[PDB]
Design a protein around this ligand. Structure first.
Ligand SMILES: CC(=O)N[C@H]1[C@H](O[C@H]2[C@@H](O)[C@H](O)[C@@H](CO)O[C@@H]2O)O[C@H](CO)[C@@H](O)[C@@H]1O
Ligand SMILES: [Ca+2]
Ligand SMILES: [Ca+2]
Length: 130
């Protein structure tokens, strides 16, 4: 049973942020609640998260590229398989955008990933293992 104000899925719990913070301060805050930033593992997990996000907002996810070499890593250290990614067309787009967000686009309407800046505050998704 997930806590108050935490969406439930499979055997895990998810918190969709309303406040904004940098990628590191987002992972810092997920850790304070004994969780990590979201780590998309299956197609079903991703679609469940999209159903609870605001199309007008971007959401930080535990996927980053620290050195800027497009070496993507998950916070929970699990392997990255590009074929199971939800990158928008044109994305990733810039070596200096080192952190992945879930964002919605209007033409055409599509949920997907986008590498954006890490310091610029955004919303985030914490994933807690129950
Ligand atoms: C349209 C879009 O995704 N805007 C987001 C914006 O994006 C940058 C850049 O990261 C994208 O690769 C390109 C794609 O055209 O658009 C912009 O130049 O980043 C913002 C945060 O940095 C998001 O809030 C916007 O949603
Ligand atoms: Ca997960
Ligand atoms: Ca981008």
């Amino acid at each position: 049973s997930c806590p108050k104000n935490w969406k439930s899925f499979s055997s895990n719990c998810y918190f969709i942020s309303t406040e904004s913070a940098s990628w590191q301060d987002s992972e810092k805050d997920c850790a304070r609640m004994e969780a990590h930033l979201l780590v998309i593992n299956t197609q079903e997990e991703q679609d469940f998260i999209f159903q609870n996000l605001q199309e007008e907002s971007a959401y930080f996810v535990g996927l980053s590229d620290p050195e800027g070499q497009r070496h993507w890593q998950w916070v929970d250290q699990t392997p990255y398989n590009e074929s199971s990614t939800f990158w928008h067309p044109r994305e990733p787009s810039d070596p200096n955008e080192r952190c992945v967000v879930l964002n919605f686009r209007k033409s055409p309407k599509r949920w997907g990933w986008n590498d954006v800046n890490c310091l610029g505050p955004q919303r985030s998704v914490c994933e807690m293992m129950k």
